[PDB]
Amino acid sequence: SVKQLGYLIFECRADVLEQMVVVYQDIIGAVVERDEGGRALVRLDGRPFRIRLDPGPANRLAAIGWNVDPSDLAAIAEQVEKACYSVVTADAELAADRAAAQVRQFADNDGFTHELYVESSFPTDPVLESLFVCGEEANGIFGLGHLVVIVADRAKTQSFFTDVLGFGLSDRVTWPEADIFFLHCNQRHHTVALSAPALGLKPGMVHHLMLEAKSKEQVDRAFAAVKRLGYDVLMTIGQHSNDKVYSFYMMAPAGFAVELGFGGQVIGDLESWHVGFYDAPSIWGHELQ
Ligand SMILES: [Fe+2]
Numbered sequence: 272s273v274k275q276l277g278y279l280i281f282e283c284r285a286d287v288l289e290q291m292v293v294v295y296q297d298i299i300g301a302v303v304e305r306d307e308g309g310r311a312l313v314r315l316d317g318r319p320f321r322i323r324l325d326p327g328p329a330n331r332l333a334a335i336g337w338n339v340d341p342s343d344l345a346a347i348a349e350q351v352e353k354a355c356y357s358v359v360t361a362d363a364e365l366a367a368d369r370a371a372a373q374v375r376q377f378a379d380n381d382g383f384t385h386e387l388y389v390e391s392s393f394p395t396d397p398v399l400e401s402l403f404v405c406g407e408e409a410n411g412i413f414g415l416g417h418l419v420v421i422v423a424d425r426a427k428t429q430s431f432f433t434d435v436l437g438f439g440l441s442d443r444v445t446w447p448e449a450d451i452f453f454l455h456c457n458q459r460h461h462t463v464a465l466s467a468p469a470l471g472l473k474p475g476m477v478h479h480l481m482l483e484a485k486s487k488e489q490v491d492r493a494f495a496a497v498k499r500l501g502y503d504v505l506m507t508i509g510q511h512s513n514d515k516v517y518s519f520y521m522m523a524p525a526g527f528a529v530e531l532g533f534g535g536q537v538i539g540d541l542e543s544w545h546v547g548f549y550d551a552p553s554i555w556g557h558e559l560q
Contacts, residue, residue: 272437273347275406275414276462277338277390278320278369279480282327283525290524291324298496298521299482299531300489302399315403315482317396319370321415322480330525332477334376336369336386337436338414347387348375350435361386379431381422382475404459404483410537411458416482419464423474425452428465438463441538442513442547451552453513455544459483460514460536479520479528483535487517490533494519509557512549520557 283291288311295313296303301322302314313322325333339347348358361374371388378384405415422428429452432438438454441461445451449469453461468474484490490508497504497519505528506520518532538544 272339272343273337273387273456274340274343275338275412275457275459276336276416276418277388277406277414278318278323278334278336279332279415279418280323280325280334280336280369281331281525282325282333283330284328285326287330287524288324288326293500294521294523294529295322297500298493298502299529300402300484300493301482314396314399315405315415316400317393318406319393321405332383334369334384334386335418336371336374336388338390339387341373341389344373344375344387344389347436351377351385351387354431354435358387379428381420381428383420402485402489404485404535408458411539413457413459413483414462416480417459417461417463418480419451419466419478421466421468421472421474421476421478423468425450425465425467429454432463432465439541439544440546441544442549444513444549444552446551449552455538455541457541458537458539460516460538477527479530481516481518481530481532483516484531484533487533490517490519490531493531497521505559507556507558510554511557512551512554513547518557 292311295301304312311324312320315321356377358375358377366374372391374386374388376386438456441453441455451466453464455461505522508519515536516532517534518530520528520530523529
């Protein structure tokens, strides 16, 4: 199965790109490097990038990078093809662009581009690693965070993630406004969550992205920074009922929410995880506006 969410690549209009650098660098506290082409490489560990912003004519999620073990790549790609998505082999330039040893790409019916990839080695970055839960940790494999997406047909997409990509269901959170399905592929409580269309959102939209700090104080600081820098909060500090994350949400200029959280529930043993069910998304806090 998929090992972890290894990278995300977004395209942004020129002004939106510069504004997103503020989000990642000056609120989230990630390291953001710039290259010769004006790209922004958002780093949370030793990897050259975990999130990359590329200039483009429209704001969109351009690629989702699913890291897989070398021994699983060909096999997973085969199951994707059996599910009737065409899988193309990336050339050397594309693989190197992703800082990956190999990449196979496909697009789904919801308009997302997926890339199954084998990782290239990269050095440790002790300072940065002390700040974010990302990739390989002492207590397991986590990837970079989670992505929550809106899709036309939740059940079908859930079946693809589950039966093709090898994700397991963590829990379902259901209340009058929404019905969300949280999926894991490693220690992180969820790497992806799925919803059908709802007030606001349409198939193929990103609901939010989440990054995970290694201390509660990072979250409080970032939250203060949103306010101090004169921005607006989407959801105030709170704790989710399912993942137990201490987090807040902000609306980013690229048109989706960004969540910074702490203390996410770990899936210790995937084989014995019990699917949970919750009637409310939060224990306390998380006040809209
Ligand atoms: Fe989240």
